[model samples]
Target: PHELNERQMERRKNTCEILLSRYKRKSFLHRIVTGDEKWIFFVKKTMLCVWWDQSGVIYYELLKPGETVNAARYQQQLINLNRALQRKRPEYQKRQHRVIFLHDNAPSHTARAVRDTLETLNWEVLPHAAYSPDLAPSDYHLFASMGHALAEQRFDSYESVKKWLDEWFAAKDDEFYWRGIHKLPERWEKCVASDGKYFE
Candidate 1:
């Protein structure tokens, strides 16, 4: 249901090539620390979460009522995510002292403050095509499953929803998280095969 214009198609092709090359070298997925924000709702609130292949749910935050993520808030989250990574996976930092950070091209995400923060942290930002939900791991992998599980349930308060999310995230094994990371290249390849068109 998504279409990519000429520029997007070119970018997608380039991104796929770069990712696949890194994948073949066994250096891409391991060093990636990806984060994204998702709307969770009292009925649809929003949460920001980051993950890496070695660790899952390294950092997560639920937005308060009426709170939205802006450039400033996003920079803070990046800082928090960096600290969490250091605390949880010291080896990741020690390994070349850098990370490949991935996120969609949201306005806040692509803002100057966020870019500066990434540069200050010495992290590498991976390129992502616009309008490509098929390429977002959280869209296809994490939130999709969470949405399914929460579909029939009802919660009385935000705290209750948070409690459920905490339990749900904790219940997942390492493999569950790895599955998404591993499948990324395949999806990229699929997009390339379709000439940058969105795939099912």
Candidate 2:
């Protein structure tokens, strides 16, 4: 990677500072949680990959073989995303506007109604470029981590596989989450360097 210029470095520093300040103000004592969702489609010969935010993984279900998710299922996924957010703060149980949702340009995500719903719900979606996997925390961090963690592991059925995923998530330590956040500056630096191509 190329060295960042003075201005670029300053911008990065300021961004990090703002994040840290928010962490402090939230009284989580240096912890913050952001949310996103991913699917594990039941492929003909393989399992679907998991999806998550830097701070946590979203609860996902396995689709039946040959089953396709429609608009209603997609909307249910959005509801599941919100439910995951509620897990962070039971009292408030509200969405956080500044919590950046990093998702790709999936049709479900870009649907006009989804956009309108996000606006109505006061959530901010990260603006993503067309084919930028490295910039997505779920793709670059969470899913990758799952692959490494589950390599060579075997499950008898989709239900068992999901149970395993839940176990992995339940036992995931803070270090894992922190590592994901610590990658943000590097991800951002690469984004800026690539003119937002994630490595042009």
Candidate 3:
């Protein structure tokens, strides 16, 4: 329901430039920690993993029966996820080594408060200037796999869905994520050609 106007195209182009520059850095993909909000539907949905890297999913939360990703809650999730990163990927814990974060432009994620908190945490955010199928590696690949897998399960309870997700995410190899992140260059070049017009 949104139209891609002139400025929007430019923003997309600018974002691609930023992405490509960073991607040029050695092991840039390895240093990246990307995350997104998603609904795991059991005929419904829930917000799960807040962050993950090339290795796999990390710091997922179940929202404790009555919760949503409100500004405060999201900030808390960020902190928790940040803690998980420091522990799980200890190399990033070293001072002077930065972990790049990639997330969408959700209201909660981009809220002033959350932005402030992110700065306080000292993260280098990979700002998302525009949304496109080519940019969302997870939505385009990882989540797509889960969507198909979950469709077959038709989960009846939250517990069941959680269990399955744990197994499914763990089942994937590190190289699987590499291929997903590695696909960016191909799409980035295509985006440059089309002026960031989305693909089907």
Candidate 4:
């Protein structure tokens, strides 16, 4: 309830409308490639590939203890992600199937360099509202499930943690990822109905 103001509320509704419109077209979802960064400890920085109908870990790098994400690093990651996507889904490299990327409005995510890279790669970015975790499948579904599964487990090292995460993600089928993707419109509709109030 406290999350969105008047302007943001309008933007949320507009974003939903825009998404819904695009979703009605043929093969829209198939062309989408959403991503976000996560901290893995025990953990380091990790990136996940949340394609419209599939999900998998793209890259997971163990960072130096105090290292963090910046615009340059994030731009490099996007380049890596583009390569990974092309390798995984060759159709994306085709003329009619450019990737539509989705990510939140973090400063690093929206940096000019990153934007240029996205343009250079011919990827289209979907609009996302600030502070809207409910709209992000990784936050609301993927990571939530991961947190629950790892709640009581203790890892001896980062490698152990990475292995565990790999196995955990591998167990989930495409249906699991689709469930998260399909839920987007429902969540957006709910958000609009609630006048941009956050929902669980």
**How would the candidate models be sorted by TM-score, starting from the highest?**
1, 3, 4, 2
Highest lDDT among the candidates is held by which one? 1
Model 3 weakest 10-residue run by lDDT: 58-67
Question: After TM-score superposition, what is the CA distance of residue 3 in candidate 3 from its true location, in Å?
Answer: 4.8
Whole-model lDDT per candidate: 0.78, 0.56, 0.75, 0.71
Alpha carbon deviation, residue 61, candidate 2 (Å): 2.8
The TM-score that candidate 1 achieves is 0.91
The C-alpha stretches of model 1 lying farther than 4 A from their native spots are 43-54, 93-97
Query: With candidate 3 superimposed using the best TM-score fit, by how many Å does residue 86's alpha carbon deviate from the native?
Result: 1.5
lDDT for each residue of candidate 3 in 117-199, tens digit (9 for 90 to 100):
99998888886766564577767778877777777787677888788878888899988877877777676766677786765
Per-prediction TM-score to the true structure, in the order listed: 0.91, 0.68, 0.89, 0.86
For model 2, how does the per-residue alpha-carbon lDDT over 1-200 read when each residue is reduced to its tens digit?
Answer: 44556565554445435544554565232222333344443313233434454445555556665455555666666666667667764433643334445556678767877777667655555445444456556667777777687666666667766777788887888678667756765566555455433253
Q: What's the lDDT for candidate 1?
A: 0.78
**Rank order (by lDDT, best first):** 1, 3, 4, 2
> Please, what are the lDDT tens digits per residue for candidate 1 over residues 1-200?
65568998888877887787777777567677776777666655545454545358888888776688888988998898888888888776676457888889999998998889889988888888787767878777888788898887777767987898889989999888888777898988887787776676
TM-score of 3: 0.89
Better candidate by TM-score, 2 or 4: 4
lDDT of 3: 0.75
Candidates 1 and 2 compared: the better one by TM-score is: 1
Question: How many residue pairs clash per model?
Answer: 5, 0, 1, 1
Worst 10 residues of 1 by lDDT: 46-55
